[PDB]
Write a protein that binds this DNA or RNA. Structure first.
Ligand SMILES: [Mg+2]
Ligand SMILES: [Mg+2]
Ligand SMILES: [Mg+2]
Ligand SMILES: [Mg+2]
Ligand SMILES: [Mg+2]
Ligand SMILES: [Mg+2]
Ligand SMILES: [Mg+2]
Ligand SMILES: [Mg+2]
Ligand SMILES: [Mg+2]
Ligand SMILES: [Mg+2]
Ligand SMILES: [Mg+2]
Ligand SMILES: [Mg+2]
Ligand SMILES: [Mg+2]
Ligand SMILES: [Mg+2]
Ligand SMILES: [Mg+2]
Ligand SMILES: [Mg+2]
Ligand SMILES: [Mg+2]
Ligand SMILES: [Mg+2]
Ligand SMILES: [Mg+2]
Ligand SMILES: [Mg+2]
Ligand SMILES: [Mg+2]
Ligand SMILES: [Mg+2]
Ligand SMILES: [Mg+2]
Ligand SMILES: [Mg+2]
Ligand SMILES: [Mg+2]
Ligand SMILES: [Mg+2]
Ligand SMILES: [Mg+2]
Ligand SMILES: [Mg+2]
Ligand SMILES: [Mg+2]
Ligand SMILES: [Mg+2]
Ligand SMILES: [Mg+2]
Ligand SMILES: [Mg+2]
Ligand SMILES: [Mg+2]
Ligand SMILES: [Mg+2]
Ligand SMILES: [Zn+2]
Lengths: 113, 53, 206, 123, 122
RNA sequence: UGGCACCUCGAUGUCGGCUCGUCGCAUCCUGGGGCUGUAGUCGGUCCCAAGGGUUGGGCUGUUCGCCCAUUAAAGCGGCACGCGAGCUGGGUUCAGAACGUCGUGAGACAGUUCGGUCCCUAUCCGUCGCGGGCGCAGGAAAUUUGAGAGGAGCUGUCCUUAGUACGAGAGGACCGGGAUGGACACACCGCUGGUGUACCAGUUGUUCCGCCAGGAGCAUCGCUGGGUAGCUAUGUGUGGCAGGGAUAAACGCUGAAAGCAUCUAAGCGUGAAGCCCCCCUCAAGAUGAGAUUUCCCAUUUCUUCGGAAAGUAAGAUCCCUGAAAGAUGAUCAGGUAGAUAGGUUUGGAGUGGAAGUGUAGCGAUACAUGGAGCGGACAAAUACUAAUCGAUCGAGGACUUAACC
């Protein structure tokens, strides 16, 4: 923690992000930049973790597609997220939900507040 | 792991040139009038910083 | 070819215009002034002497107060020299601001490494261990010291000692952002030293 | 980075609890140098907890004070314990004082092993 | 991170069902391959009647890994098992269908047919 | 492979591996060149070159070898077949037992098979780091030159030039430009991860705090789920980029000896990953002890001149608070001319919704007060506590000559 770092980096923080905590479903409108193309693809899943402070904060979203589970990590304040929505608000008793990595369907389901 | 040759007197004393011990860092208490260690409570008048403890 | 002295503050990251994310290190370089100018006909070489950070009237003795009073300004804390620099600039007593660098320049960072104490040979020189099982009794030892013939052991036989604390420079290091009014300087990468270490920034030799 | 005192984690915590309670009761004890330099912080944090004066703070402090009798008063004989003294006598003394409830005074080496002894008191 | 003696599932329609890696191509002392790298490998378990038989030495590309890759923009992707696709001398798969998601790094290595055949390219 | 029997039988430990290497050139790769049965691609042989490189496995105690899969390449040798007061003992080479064979027999076979105690606190030199003393013709504080010496010199693939030059076709370029890797090295913790025994939470048994509630001790930190600062790689940033001088092999110009010719005799020009430079680090004990800027000045007494001691100046240290440093010294930040350490008040990471009370439920339990409570090492203010008081060391600058002070 340093105050000079905070003053330098305060400009690039994103004020348009909503409030979410680990354990609820989100939808990420990530941008996919090709060589000369711009497209937006959707990634939807439950957030597993959220760590760090300041501009260097990241969160992780988990999704099961075609049987194989996929985890994709994003910086919180990246300009490559067009929009981030909070779909559900799950109920959890942990800050890191790593136990979901060893659970298949119908046992990884999360309640709703 | 065992001495090849015994050590002479000159070499023994040369090694022992650094095995002395230093002089204490003391001066005289203003109230006592005799010697005491700096930053320590003098044991004669039982005072530090001009105040008894 | 221009240079300043600086104080390493920390390390963070910034987003570029293209959206990519890069790590940067923050260096603040306030209060540094030009003190002396060495010429070929007086000293035998050309250099500029820069004093970086000022300190109290106490902690500074009479000789160095006289040296700084040969110019203006109060006594400083760090003083270094820069060679291979133009002397037509740098009027005596004039301050040097971070604006001497522009975004996209290439610099060389010099400093003193972090200190590690008495360190072994697996860590200091990156050697390899022996087996940890199969009845072995040889884990983290230096090795053999050479042939029987010389009746001695050669030089540059690497052995345990004091590891860190040496001077290190890294080259071709890019500069990202310059902010004049905060007297800071953002450099992409990392530079040798702990926090609050003196860092010497100069234009890349190559 | 605090300080290991030549003893394991469970042993170290037991030592710190003993010296902290001995300083509350007697208010003037004589120990070695590093040992006193370490108990200084825990005693001062404990006195801050007493300054708060809450029930939650009382439970926090009770999870550290050793349960021993300071002295007995004729209210009917009713002993007073160390926590009662901490929350009724020691804490109100420094209500107007923010920090630094202890001082360290140096003595000189011990005879048996040359340890540098000091005297630490709460004033 | 996959080096010699690692076993990893195959994710195509050829006869193979499990594959043990033999060598990592592309250097002298190279000891680790990741997504988009070709490896020489042998077929340990195969399905009956397939085109690729048990005990065969083939080379194949790595499609998904337990520890994935990071992009230039600072994001990461990680899967839940190691998979593989058996390829020809050129970069064309021997099978006809591909199962499961596929990393996006195959586009930059010009594995176009595999990416096209994949159900989902992440 | 042998011959001899000169040192060692009052002991010179003997095979393969492991760790660490270092030299030679009779060069495996990369660099330069001559000849070619050199059309091109791919090659062969020789000359100059030792600067860096020169794999991972199956079988065997194996060196060696055969095989699988790669690579620019998977060089040959010396150093007590380098290296056991550095490691392992699978093999050789003790005592047990068994097979084949030999012997009447005890036993034997460098035929085979199973099992079989590897001791030592480093004195001197040597090697790697760290201090004290004196020297450098006054005493000090900083900044430096560089004689010398170490470090690093590795290399692939793809695109374009161009289907161009070449060639009947088949096939298919040198030179040049761009992109991106393998192995290695240095630094660092913003990112991905590891640890994190004075951080947060769940939980089993039993004992304790008089009881409930709330907590504490022991059980590997009792176990389990996370994790701050520091330390880290498998993580990130960067490097071997472009070049200069003189040359080796070789190719030439001008040119006589020898009216021609001739690369040589006098004289010039090209020419290598090699030599000396460029790049990084150490470096004035470099007794040849160097240089620049600044500070203190010329005191008092004893002497046979020579010289001696004794208060000091600039300055430093003893002592004390420490960490960005550290085995101990040392180095750095400070000592009231104060933010050096602890405390206190605000914060941050991390954990995850404290105690008390209330409501719902017969009960386990759930909800609210409330992103609550706790919060080692991280940040900022604050003199509240400890750096109080003192003491010690430390210069008056030899002689000769020259310009001239
Ligand atoms: Mg958080
Ligand atoms: Mg310096
Ligand atoms: Mg062991
Ligand atoms: Mg010799
Ligand atoms: Mg315990
Ligand atoms: Mg004879
Ligand atoms: Mg003998
Ligand atoms: Mg040769
Ligand atoms: Mg040739
Ligand atoms: Mg070589
Ligand atoms: Mg096997
Ligand atoms: Mg040998
Ligand atoms: Mg021999
Ligand atoms: Mg020999
Ligand atoms: Mg030996
Ligand atoms: Mg030993
Ligand atoms: Mg018989
Ligand atoms: Mg046995
Ligand atoms: Mg010295
Ligand atoms: Mg030199
Ligand atoms: Mg063709
Ligand atoms: Mg980290
Ligand atoms: Mg109870
Ligand atoms: Mg008990
Ligand atoms: Mg744990
Ligand atoms: Mg268990
Ligand atoms: Mg070069
Ligand atoms: Mg030349
Ligand atoms: Mg000098
Ligand atoms: Mg600190
Ligand atoms: Mg000081
Ligand atoms: Mg403080
Ligand atoms: Mg609650
Ligand atoms: Mg009820
Ligand atoms: Zn006294």
């Amino acid at each position: 923690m340093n105050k000079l770092i905070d003053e330098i980096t305060k400009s690039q923080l994103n004020p348009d992000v909503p409030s979410f905590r680990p354990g609820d479903t989100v939808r990420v409108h990530a941008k996919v930049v090709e060589g000369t193309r711009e497209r937006i693809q959707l990634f939807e899943g439950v957030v597993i973790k959220r760590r760090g402070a300041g501009i260097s904060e990241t969160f992780t979203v988990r999704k099961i597609s075609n049987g194989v589970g996929v985890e994709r990590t994003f910086p919180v304040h990246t300009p490559r997220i067009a929009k981030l929505e909070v779909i559900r608000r799950g109920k959890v008793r942990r800050a890191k939900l790593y136990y979901l990595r060893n659970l298949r369907g119908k046992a990884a389901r999360i309640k709703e507040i | 792991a065992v001495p090849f040759r015994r050590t002479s007197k000159a070499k023994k004393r040369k090694r022992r040139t650094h095995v002395k011990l230093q002089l204490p860092g003391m001066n005289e208490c203003s109230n006592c009038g005799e010697y005491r260690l700096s930053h320590h409570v003098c044991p004669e008048c039982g005072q530090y910083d001009g105040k008894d403890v | 070819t221009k240079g300043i002295l600086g104080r390493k503050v920390g390390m963070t990251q910034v987003f570029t215009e293209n959206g990519e994310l890069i790590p940067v290190t923050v260096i603040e370089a306030a209060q540094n002034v030009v003190l002396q100018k060495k010429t070929v006909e007086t000293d035998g070489y050309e250099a500029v002497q820069i004093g970086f950070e000022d300190k109290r009237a106490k902690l500074s003795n009479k000789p160095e107060q006289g040296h700084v009073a040969k110019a203006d300004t109060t006594p400083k804390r760090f003083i270094r020299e820069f060679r291979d620099v133009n002397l037509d600039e740098y009027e005596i007593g004039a301050e040097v601001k971070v604006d001497v660098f522009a975004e996209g320049d290439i610099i060389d960072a010099t400093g003193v490494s972090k200190g590690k104490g008495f360190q072994g040979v697996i860590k200091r020189h990156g050697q390899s261990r022996g087996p940890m099982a199969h009845g072995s009794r040889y884990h983290r030892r230096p090795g053999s010291m050479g042939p029987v013939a010389p009746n001695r052991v050669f030089k540059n036989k690497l052995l345990p000692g004091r590891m860190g604390g040496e001077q290190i420079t890294i080259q071709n290091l890019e500069i990202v952002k310059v902010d004049v009014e905060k007297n800071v300087l953002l450099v992409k990468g990392n530079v040798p030293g702990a926090k609050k270490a003196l860092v010497q920034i100069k234009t890349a030799t190559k | 980075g605090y300080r290991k005192l030549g003893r394991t984690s469970s042993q170290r915590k037991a030592l710190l609890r003993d010296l902290a309670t001995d300083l509350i009761v007697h208010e003037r004890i004589e120990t070695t140098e590093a040992r006193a330099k370490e108990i200084r912080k825990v005693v001062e944090k404990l006195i801050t907890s007493g300054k708060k004066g809450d029930l939650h703070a009382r439970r926090q402090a009770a999870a550290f004070i050793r349960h021993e009798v300071v002295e007995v008063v004729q209210v009917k004989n009713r002993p007073v314990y160390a926590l009662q003294k901490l929350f009724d006598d020691v804490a109100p003394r420094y209500a107007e004082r923010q920090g630094g409830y202890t001082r360290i005074l140096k003595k000189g080496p011990r005879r048996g092993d040359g340890a540098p002894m000091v005297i630490i008191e709460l004033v | 991170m996959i080096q010699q003696e690692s076993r990893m599932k195959v994710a195509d329609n050829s006869g193979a069902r499990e594959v043990l890696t033999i060598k990592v191509l592309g250097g002298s002392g190279r000891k680790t391959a990741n997504i988009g790298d070709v490896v020489v490998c042998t077929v340990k378990q195969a399905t009956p009647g397939g085109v690729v038989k048990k005990g065969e030495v083939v080379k194949a590309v790595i499609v998904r890994t337990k520890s994935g890759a990071r992009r230039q923009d600072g994001s990461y992707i990680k899967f839940d098992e190691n998979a593989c696709v058996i390829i020809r001398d050129d970069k064309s798969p021997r099978g006809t269908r591909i199962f499961g998601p596929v990393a996006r790094e195959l586009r930059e290595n010009n594995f176009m047919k595999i990416v096209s055949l994949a159900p989902e390219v992440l």
